[PDB]
Amino acid sequence: ARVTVQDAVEKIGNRFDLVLVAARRARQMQVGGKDPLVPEENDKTTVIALREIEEGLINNQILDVRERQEQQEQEAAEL
Amino acid sequence: RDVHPTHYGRVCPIETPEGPNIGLINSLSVYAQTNEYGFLETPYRKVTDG
Amino acid sequence: EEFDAIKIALASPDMIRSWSFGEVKKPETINYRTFKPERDGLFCARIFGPVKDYECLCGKYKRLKHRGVICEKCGVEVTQTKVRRERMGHIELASPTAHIWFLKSLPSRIGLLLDMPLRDIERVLYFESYVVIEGGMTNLERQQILTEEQYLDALEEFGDEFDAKMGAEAIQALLKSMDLEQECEQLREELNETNSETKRKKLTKRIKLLEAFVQSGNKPEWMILTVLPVLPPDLRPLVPLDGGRFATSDLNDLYRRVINRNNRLKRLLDLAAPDIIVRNEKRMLQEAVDALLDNGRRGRAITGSNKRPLKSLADMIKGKQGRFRQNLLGKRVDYSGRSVITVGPYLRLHQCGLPKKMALELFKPFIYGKLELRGLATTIKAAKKMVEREEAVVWDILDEVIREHPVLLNRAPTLHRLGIQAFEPVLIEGKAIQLHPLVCAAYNADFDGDQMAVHVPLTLEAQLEARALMMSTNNILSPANGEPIIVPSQDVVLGLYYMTRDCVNAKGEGMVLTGPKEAERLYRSGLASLHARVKVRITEYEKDANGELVAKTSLKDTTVGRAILWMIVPKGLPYSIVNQALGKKAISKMLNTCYRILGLKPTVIFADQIMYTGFAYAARSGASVGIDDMVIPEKKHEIISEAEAEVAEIQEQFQSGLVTAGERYNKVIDIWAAANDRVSKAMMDNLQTETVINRDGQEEKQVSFNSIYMMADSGARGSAAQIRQLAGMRGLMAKPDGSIIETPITANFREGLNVLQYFISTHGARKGLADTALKTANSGYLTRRLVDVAQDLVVTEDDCGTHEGIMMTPVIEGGDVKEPLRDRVLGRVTAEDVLKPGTADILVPRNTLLHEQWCDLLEENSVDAVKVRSVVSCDTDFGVCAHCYGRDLARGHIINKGEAIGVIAAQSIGEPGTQLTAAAESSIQVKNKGSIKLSNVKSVVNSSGKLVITSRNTELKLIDEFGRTKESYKVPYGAVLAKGDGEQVAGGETVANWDPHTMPVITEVSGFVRFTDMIDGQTITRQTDELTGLSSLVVLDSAERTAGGKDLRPALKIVDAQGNDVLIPGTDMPAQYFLPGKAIVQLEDGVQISSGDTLARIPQESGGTKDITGGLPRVADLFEARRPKEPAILAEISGIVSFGKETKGKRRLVITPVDGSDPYEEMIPKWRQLNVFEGERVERGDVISDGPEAPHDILRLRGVHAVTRYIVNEVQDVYRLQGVKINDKHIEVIVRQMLRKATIVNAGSSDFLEGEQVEYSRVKIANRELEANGKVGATYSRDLLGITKASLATESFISAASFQETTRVLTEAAVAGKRDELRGLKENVIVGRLIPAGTGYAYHQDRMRRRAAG
Amino acid sequence: RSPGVFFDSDKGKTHSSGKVLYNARIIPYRGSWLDFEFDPKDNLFVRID
Amino acid sequence: RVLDATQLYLGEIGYSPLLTAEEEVYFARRALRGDVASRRRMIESNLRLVVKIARRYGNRGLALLDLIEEGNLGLIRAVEKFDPERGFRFSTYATWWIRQTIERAIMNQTRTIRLPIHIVKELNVYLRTARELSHKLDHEPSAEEIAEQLDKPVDDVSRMLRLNERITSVDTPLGGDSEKALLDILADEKENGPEDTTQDDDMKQSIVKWLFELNAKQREVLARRFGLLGYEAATLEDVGREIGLTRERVRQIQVEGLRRLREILQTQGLNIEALFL
DNA sequence: ACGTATGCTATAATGTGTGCAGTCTGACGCGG
DNA sequence: TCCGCGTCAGACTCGTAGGATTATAGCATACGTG
């Protein structure tokens, strides 16, 4: 997680799409103030986003479902 | 730039920047001196009849 | 702000007026005391806007209360100073003026369009001669120049009916009258008649320019400027210095030259002055305009104050010092610092020392941020002061943000990607950066006073990018070669060698230990040496069939040192690897083994631990540099004293007059050369095994523990080559001319050089260090050249869906296999099903990666030749597939889609050359028994009874029991074979023998020698001796030859006893061997000869260490595709050879193919010898002549996979000579890019037609729609392009101007009216956008679906 | 370079001919240059400055 | 042939009349009465005289070609106002014009920063006085030494020497070798970097918080006076235009807003901390 | 009134020239 | 169209150092704004 990012690349595949998924999640915790899934243990967003991907909690499909699940709650509610 | 066998006694073979201004810049030899016209000249012990 | 494309078109006088916000009509910059703009001047605020943010000049309207208010008095708007660099101006030119970029920038452009030369146009401009615009009376036709005499003749005689004028006015009217529609059709008609090469070229280029000009919407009148734009004043500044001085750009000065002369012309047109004066004024005006656009071009550049030339407009867009290279692709960057680096031997791989006061300033906005969070700072200027006072609790906050934050460390120069690596900063008190020893290799960073730039990744993406891609742990192997660049060096290797290496008995021999821990116990207890043979019990962990590790415990007889090293060794490798004495070469395999087996993590750890123990134990050894360590052999004074008398013997023979000066010069070099190797080997023979004095019972022989040897043997520093100078003999030095001194240096560095021995050492020293400075630029310029062409290549598709590739064989050159097939065909997707010898069962699939483990089964089955899916065989339009490239050698598995290869490839090729800056081949000895197998050989038996070879490229194979090539040699021309073709030889037998310092000319027939065209004085010379009178004849070449015997070819003609010619067996060729220049001949006219006798001996002086200095140019020329001055002839199409007609020896060839009825003729020189001898079954592209192969000749005939195989072999040959390791796929990248454009041959559905040369990807996309719709196919023929040209070919003009020739690129792109839609990296890095590759590949393609969705 | 006269030869201006073309040049302390040079056809030429 | 604009014009003047004493009078007498052809000739003829006068007036401001053009304009004004009836020659009268027109045109197009004649005229006498002094003092004269010989002001001499200070181009090599110019050093005055930009943004956002933390009528009256929230920076007396309409109550409420705000800066950690600034 | 600008003077005088000249490999573009 | 000669295009990457010019008459009414 701090030294290694190979365990994180194992899960997704593309070194490039890993940085994009990890960044988007890092930004949700940085701005939205979302909760970390893994014990943060005094690490910055960078590392935590990798840990969730490394262990297998964060994914392209996972984050897209979760997004519109909060946004569809708003749809039904407004009108 | 290359060291020329004339340098012997006149100019130092090992005194020059190692930069692009390498072979152009050169220090004068220890006992080297200027010729009355302009060239360089070096001291030499004359040998008379051996 | 967010766009799609950038367009370039010609600036119409009407268009220039759109940008201009006023007309500068005065040169007045500012008032002298009141530092303010002048009335309609060059800094006018009424034209270019206000000075400060929202302030008029006189001061009537202030700040945003008067948002967009225009003042009455001064007439100045109240907007931001923003507009002072945005708002432009113009000048109404009294008389029209010509653009230098559409006149001088060749092609003429203005002259190319008019079908008019340069001289003609210029003499019109400078008012030397008039030019006809249109003659009503057909007496005078258009574009006919009339001298000042000839204008007057037509005036009174004809007049009026003819309209002709002078100056830039005339040529504009000529451009304004010419019809692009009609003169396009006229040229097309003349093309149908009788077309040649030059005629059709000229016509087609004009045709396309004419059509391009109409479709670009440009009008040829805009080539002449009626309106001249003015640059915004802020972009040509008049700003004051701190010292009360001012400073102005040279543009302002050049502008004042234009406006003054233009206003003086307005004044003279008011006075109706005589034309003679008006002429000067118009010439001047043009001089000023041309000097403003591009100063140094038409004539002398207008020099200014400090006798230097004024910097013009074009100059700020031109080359290195232009905006592109200097202020756009290269940038000074914030959150950046540099400092002296020093060692960090305590750090782990993923760590680096960062000074506190450095990181303090670097992370300034991150302190202010974390401060407001804790509530210590309420505002930022409060946080600013908290940092300034350097109070204690601010250090702890700085320390907080930096944790889990990577920093980029760069070293100059940035050769390859590894020139930057990311680490986790460790704050250290001190002004020095501390760098990790193992990655020192990648940077080439020596702690001798190196500095490394620091950079802070700001964005979270940059923190992830730095940790993911640019982290030191994620970057192990080189991208160039699949090899670990983080290999321990110097002390590390020496320390391990010391440990593993063993010695006789010593303390505690043959003891018995529980584990490798008891070995550390006893050594550090002082009851065992690291060099004690011991039977220890170690438990090794071997991998099984699955992922599970099997444990095995056994007694290994190894040393105390070897046992201790096992502690560092991860569990998964066998113990047999550390059971040997470890060296640099052995250690490099340990890490590679560790990598291919366990993975990444285990290696990083292993690599570090190897380094740490290496340094530690190297220091424990006590390894020093005493002067008794530099042992001179026993008998040096015995070798030299009698090797001197050897040379003194020949010296007395020369003055007698037998051995010539040249023969003595070569003969004395051979004596010294033997003595030098004699001293070298006696030295190491006394130094390597100096330890012959041991114990136990009486004696034993052992490796020497001489400090210097251990330091060389281990592979830590220096080598056998360096020790030679230290203890042995310095060797023979080289003159600055290139000739080698007859007398070398006898002494060494221990003994001391005399005064001259040092003077001699200088010559070699200064020239070696001169090529370190000067020759580095050619190699660094190559890196630049390679990159530009390979910018666009990125992995796009996953699978190109192609079943093509190129076959690969094992590099077995010079007996010992140079490069095995396993390594060559490693990490490359195959294109064909490759099984074992017995064709009855498949072993490896088609579309599969070759892992080192799959390549191990290639060894069991002994693969012959393999079709690997290559880069050039890719069908992916705009990029390549991951299958075609294969593994990313840097990573260690299949390449990611989106990774930008082209740049990785270019770097890999240029990196070694840039950092990288005994020919007694008498006889081949075969080593294993075999049957002799020659190929491409045509020999003839001689008088002696020996198979003499009369063919240039003869190869010699060594066939084993089952029938496969083991060893391979190059047998040269006129070589004497021991045994002919098919005969058995034993091991250690001289199969071939020849003279190296000579190239003989050997006959094929017997009889007498005739002299033809060998006149004394014209073609040859003559020199005789004494008593008898033996004369030698020396053939003069065009250099030493007079104009009399230039077309005379000198040759030694063969004749019989009668005097007639002797036919060469089975050919109608009378025997005639043409002697080249400087050919020494011993036999004079009228001498009997047998077949196989040497007629003449051509000298082969070749004693210059090629190194990299004289080997990089050859690489460049290959890439740049520059045809040699003696290319070899090849057959075009297959069929029947039929020799035809001749012209004073100049041979033709009337080839009549079997299917092809129409003959084909091509001409051949006389002196050049062929390989085929007529009437033969030739195929497409057979070797007819010998010499260098032209790259264009290869692809033209033998297709893509032939030219790719050539460049790859040819390039690698030069790098293999140096021990530079590059995968062929990296060269294949550049090759692919060199095959970008292709000439079209055949009319298609699109308006392609003939003579057009379009990109290969675009024309193939048209063929996609054609095979679906039918219509007419567009047949083609791929062309090869040099690097410099392949870069300027890409549709992107931005990428082309950013490279070079920037003055031309822009003008051609302006006239074409081309719009660049951006694909390359250079293109998006300029505009400062997301790179359409790597991290940004996922983003750019998400914008491409915005375009696709409607 | 010391003023006076100096004899040189481009060991192959045109490696086409490969002819060693010999040339002379008078170098003054102040003044115009005076060069003499041969050509592929060994015709003596003078090029002031 | 000839492709230098210099030699071409210099050729065309070389094939133009060279007039006699009585010829000049014949043409000039018709030139005043407007013969058209006559004015062209006298001019064409004496272009040769303009070039000889421009051979001494070079290396001062413009080029030789620039001096001839403006020297020709002097010959033209000399032809526009010559007196043929006078027995004196033309070459004499025309020289006074050609020397004048050149000097004047150099005085304008020589300096980038347009220096009018008045400040320049005087500067010359100060410089030409420096000659006299320099030769007899053998020491380059000071601002005082020039002032003591003319008996004129000290600041005048000094300020006139300040305008003689010439320019260095921002595109001038530093060290006589491709390295860096003055533009790669000289900074931008107008825009100060983010740190100075964010100073004011953060300082002025902190004030927006401090005003909403004051009284409703205290932050109304205090803000609209200084022009912080309002549109125009009013005075104690001018706050009465809005709703205040008071002179005493406005001054007590302005200062009441500032006193409560001074305690807000003492507690947040500025006051004397931000006093140095 | 103060600052800038335009103007005239009259021996005769009538065609300029200046300034670095071991760079070099490679590549076209007009004539011949 | 092919071969000689002219002009014109490049020249590995980052750090540091320091300085200076000549001269344009002389005086009297004409042109622009508080």
Ligand SMILES: O=c1ccn([C@@H]2O[C@H](COP(=O)(O)OP(=O)(O)OP(=O)(O)O)[C@@H](O)[C@H]2O)c(=O)[nH]1
């Ligand atoms: O002009 C130069 C000279 C040298 N260098 C660079 O500086 C370094 C000087 O040479 P090093 O001291 O680094 O040499 P090395 O490690 O390759 O070999 P040894 O001394 O161990 O024999 C090398 O890495 C070289 O690339 C330049 O970049 N430019």
Ligand SMILES: [Mg+2]
């Ligand atoms: Mg170093």
Ligand SMILES: [Mg+2]
């Ligand atoms: Mg080193």
Ligand SMILES: [Zn+2]
């Ligand atoms: Zn105003």
